[PDB]
Ligand binder design. Structure first.
Ligand SMILES: Nc1nc2c(ncn2[C@@H]2O[C@H](COP(=O)(O)OP(=O)(O)OP(=O)(O)O)[C@@H](O)[C@H]2O)c(=O)[nH]1
Ligand SMILES: [Mg+2]
Lengths: 382, 267, 50, 172, 49
């Protein structure tokens, strides 16, 4: 009855204008995930360069004398593929494609003293037996501190941090597909696993048994799974191709709402545009949900789910052809289709020039968006 | 909205009343009818297995502690069974709560007619009377029945009554309201538990004897019976002095019982 | 009827044991193929990033 | 509300094998099957009906009748507007246990919950052991309505729910 | 018999993805060299400007 979707929701009627406030290029290669500390004090990025960098969100706000990552960690090795803060800015868990899962203790620092990372319990996964971690979520089960994570060999393991044992393990059916992403219920009742073949499979966490497996009609890879802030039985999937962010009722397996930003006709399984949404941010806001997407086409979109015609592009120069948004009913699913409308030099484009791998938002005084790219560039948008 | 959270309990050594165990139903199938064995033993056709789909089985409940029986076995009263074994009978055991040590068990044996004057065990099951932290078992319990054997009262028992094992507990917790209710999710999840259960019905020839323990009520409260011993609060006044009395003697100021035995036999 | 029952029972047992063997093989296939998929999915995005 | 006027939660309780699932399926889906799959936990189906000009959404709940999946406390009776106590007319023990089931209703359901005694499997006339008079006198002593239904040949299944829905509506 | 064909097909798909990924790795490496050549020409042109 009293689960909060975010600990710090965006300001009322927040519609990001898209002003670049920090261009941060500090990873050698692609950033894979951005997680924001639950109190929003810090945000962290992981990268193929094998580093974890912690950023002080408080230092992006109007005092950007030196936008530097307060902390860097590089000892895990391999490519750091996922990370998550643990509901309190003291612990950050990271995973590598080598197989290591590490808990990192971030120290709160008074500026006279420097901060640091201290590694805590570390877990190494056998590449043959368990594979590397492909997604990891932390939640507080009151009693426990479960760092749930999914591995290439289909095991979705619930690791209790305040102990060293597993709270649970869920052996995902690899016949379904490779786990690409998974989402956990805010009420900690059920989870959904998204696979590389489009399967999204639900697990009851109270009983710990699988209950549903709906697959995408085109068997398109699931790039992101987010639970719906409003409908407990719904899950938001970001799909391979067409910048498709479809919403699926897990009680029936029906598509309920689709975002289509593609040249292809809506919900068409024929020729998908190469573009996909890699990161999604959904908020209930003031009961009028919004959804921020970014991905392959390097455009940060804002979808007004209550008022689709107000949807717009955040990042991307005005010189690019303007877009319009139309709510339609295709199979019965309502679809917000995006359609293309037929001082010195030009100001430098502030947008990303490579695939935006993830989107995050934090609140310090105002709402900020953080997007990271496949070249290692992290950008903060005021 | 809800009654308070207070936990009420009684010490087992303070509840001077007989233990009562309800013998509920025996679910499950029996060992079919192996007609190979009947050709070898013609008396076997004259046995409850081969005479009725539900023979009029009976259960014997006996309490054991340290591998020894605390008292005689108590038998369920005769009940004619046709399509299901449902005794539904409360058995007053010959043991009281003060009489029960921490490792007391009830060995329950299901018996069947095997020709004249001979009962064969259909199965046996043993469950400890106190839980993991010494609370007398409460409510409805389903016990695994071990085929063709009597319940074992030895410590440790070889016939313990305690996938579907875990799920049934969660299902009981759900029915009692301890699990959070999620209609859309309960509807989907219980169909899977049913599939698991049916698979276990076909996969294995398991039997369960559902039993129940009485609830101690006073003024609409629920009291758990926790194992205690009288004087269990008497934390001994141990003191570490040895200033004068270096060598304590436990028999120190005690009647010489070997002299009193002698006095009683000579004088 | 007893002897040929044992023969067919053994035939069923031997053939079903093979189905389990191919189930164990697919299990390993799924494991191995999933890691190839994961590597191909990262190469797909790396080819795009280049 | 434009979707429905009232939402009544109906609960089906009774011994295992009496036909609580089959009655639910015969009412919500209009289907019957001999394949027994013991209900564990809780199930529910939704049927909207027309009654006295009003639109009533019935959420009928089906419960485990096996003792193995039952407990002393029972949360399912909570919020139920009406409870159907199903017994198998061919099974005397099921009818005898109706008393037990009514005690669970009395202590766990609402004080004014509606009740209905249903004798299912009335199509098994050769195996019937509980006579209509025996059950009608029992039900009338308690004042609960009584029907003899059959999920197999749909006999009187609709009217048993229509009765409950009507009686709850008379209560609201 | 179907499991046999499944193992046959699945054996080919393993070989197919393994060789497909090698082409992806070769292509990606080959284009990273070309990308480095673009970046040095761009760095020489920027410096020239
Ligand atoms: N002849 C006849 N048989 C019925 C009827 N209804 C149910 N049955 C049979 O009895 C079996 C048990 O019915 P269920 O509906 O599964 O009984 P239940 O009350 O749901 O039992 P639980 O789910 O374990 O509580 C069914 O499989 C049918 O074979 C009926 O109306 N007439
Ligand atoms: Mg049922």
């Amino acid at each position: 009855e009293n689960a909060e979707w975010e600990s710090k929701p965006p300001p009322p009627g927040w519609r990001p204008k898209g002003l670049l406030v920090a261009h941060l290029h500090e990873h050698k290669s692609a950033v894979n995930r951005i997680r924001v500390s639950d109190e929003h004090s810090l945000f962290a990025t992981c990268s193929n360069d094998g580093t974890v960098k912690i950023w002080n969100s408080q230092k992006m706000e109007g005092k950007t004398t030196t936008t530097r990552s307060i902390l860097t960690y590089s000892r895990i090795g391999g490519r750091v593929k996922t990370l998550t803060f643990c509901q309190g800015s003291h612990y950050l868990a990271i995973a590598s494609d080598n197989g290591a899962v590490q808990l990192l203790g971030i120290e709160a620092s008074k500026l006279p003293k420097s901060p640091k990372i201290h590694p805590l319990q570390s877990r190494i996964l056998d590449q043959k037996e368990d594979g590397c971690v492909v997604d990891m979520h932390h939640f507080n089960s009151g009693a426990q501190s479960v760092l749930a994570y999914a591995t290439v060999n289909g095991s979705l393991v619930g690791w209790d941090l305040r102990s060293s044992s597993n709270a649970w393990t869920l052996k995902h059916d690899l016949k379904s597909g490779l786990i690409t992403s998974f989402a956990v219920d805010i009420h900690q009742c059920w989870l959904c696993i998204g696979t590389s073949s489009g399967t999204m499979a639900c697990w009851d966490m109270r009983f710990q048994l699988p209950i549903s497996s709906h697959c995408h009609p085109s068997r398109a890879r699931i790039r992101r799974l987010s639970m719906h802030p409003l409908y407990q039985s719904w899950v938001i999937a970001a799909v391979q191709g067409n910048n498709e962010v479809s919403m699926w009722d897990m009680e029936t397996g029906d598509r309920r709402f689709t975002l289509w930003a593609s040249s292809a006709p809506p919900l068409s399984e024929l020729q998908p545009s190469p573009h996909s949404v890699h990161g999604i941010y959904c908020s209930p806001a003031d009961g009028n949900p919004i959804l921020l997407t970014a991905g392959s086409d390097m455009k940060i979109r804002f979808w007004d789910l209550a008022y689709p015609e107000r949807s717009y592009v955040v990042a991307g120069s005005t010189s690019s052809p303007s877009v319009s948004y139309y709510r339609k009913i295709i199979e019965g699913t309502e679809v917000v289709q995006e359609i293309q409308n037929k001082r010195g030099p030009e100001s430098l484009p502030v947008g990303h020039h490579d695939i935006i791998t993830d989107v995050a938002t934090f609140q310090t005084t105002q709402g900020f968006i953080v997007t990271a790219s496949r070249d290692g560039i992290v950008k903060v948008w005021k | 909205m809800g009654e308070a959270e207070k936990f009420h309990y009684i010490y087992s050594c303070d509840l001077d009343i007989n233990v009562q165990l309800k013998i509920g139903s025996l679910e499950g199938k029996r060992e079919q009818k192996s007609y190979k064995a009947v050709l070898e033993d013609p008396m076997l056709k004259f046995s409850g297995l081969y005479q009725e789909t539900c023979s009029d089985l009976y259960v014997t409940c006996q309490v054991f502690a340290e591998g020894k029986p605390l008292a005689l076995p108590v038998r369920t009263s005769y009940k004619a069974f046709s399509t299901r074994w449902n005794w539904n009978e409360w058995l007053k055991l010959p043991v009281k709560y003060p009489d029960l040590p921490r490792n007391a068990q009830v060995a329950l044996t299901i018996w069947d007619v095997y020709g004249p004057g001979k009962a064969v065990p259909v199965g046996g099951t043993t469950v400890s009377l106190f839980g993991k932290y010494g609370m007398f078992r409460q409510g409805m319990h389903d016990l695994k029945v071990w085929p063709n054997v009597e319940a074992d009262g030895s410590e440790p028992t070889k016939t313990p009554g305690r996938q579907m094992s875990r799920l049934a507990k969660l299902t009981k917790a759900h029915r009692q309201g301890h699990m959070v209710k999620v209609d859309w999710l309960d509807r989907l999840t219980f169909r899977e538990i049913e599939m698991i259960n049916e698979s276990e019905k076909r996969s294995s020839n398991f039997m369960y004897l559902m039993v129940e323990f009485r609830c101690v009520k006073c003024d609409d409260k629920e009291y758990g019976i926790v194992y205690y011993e009288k004087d269990g609060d008497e934390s001994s006044p141990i003191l570490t002095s040895f200033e004068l009395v270096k060598v304590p003697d436990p028999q120190m100021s005690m009647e010489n019982l070997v002299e009193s035995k002698h006095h009683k036999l000579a004088r | 009827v007893e002897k040929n029952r044992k023969i067919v029972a053994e035939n069923l047992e031997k053939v079903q044991a093979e189905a389990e063997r191919l189930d164990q093989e697919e299990a390993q296939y799924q494991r191995e193929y999933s890691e190839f998929k994961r590597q191909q999915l990262e190469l797909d995005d790396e080819l795009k990033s280049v | 509300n434009p979707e429905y006027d009232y939402l009544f939660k109906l609960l089906l309780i009774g011994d295992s094998g009496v036909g609580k699932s089959c009655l639910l399926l015969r009412f919500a889906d209009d289907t019957y099957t001999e394949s027994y799959i013991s209900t564990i936990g809780v199930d529910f189906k939704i049927r909207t009906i027309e009654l006295d000009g009003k639109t009533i959404k019935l959420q009928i709940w089906d419960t485990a009748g096996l003792e193995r999946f039952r407990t002393i406390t029972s949360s399912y009776y909570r919020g139920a507007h009406g409870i159907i106590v199903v017994y198998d007319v061919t099974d005397q023990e099921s009818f005898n246990n109706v008393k037990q089931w009514l005690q669970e209703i009395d202590r766990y359901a609402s004080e004014n919950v509606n009740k209905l005694l249903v004798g299912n499997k009335c199509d098994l006339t050769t195996k019937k052991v509980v006579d209509y008079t025996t059950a009608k006198e029992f039900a009338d002593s308690l004042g609960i309505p009584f029907l003899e239904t059959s999920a197999k040949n749909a006999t009187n299944v609709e009217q048993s729910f229509m009765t409950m829905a009507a009686e709850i509506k008379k209560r609201m | 018999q179907k499991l046999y064909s499944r193992a046959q097909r699945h054996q080919e798909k393993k070989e197919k993805i393994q060789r497909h990924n090698r082409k992806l790795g070769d292509l990606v490496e080959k284009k990273t060299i070309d990308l480095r050549s673009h970046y040095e020409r761009l760095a020489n042109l920027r410096r020239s400007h």
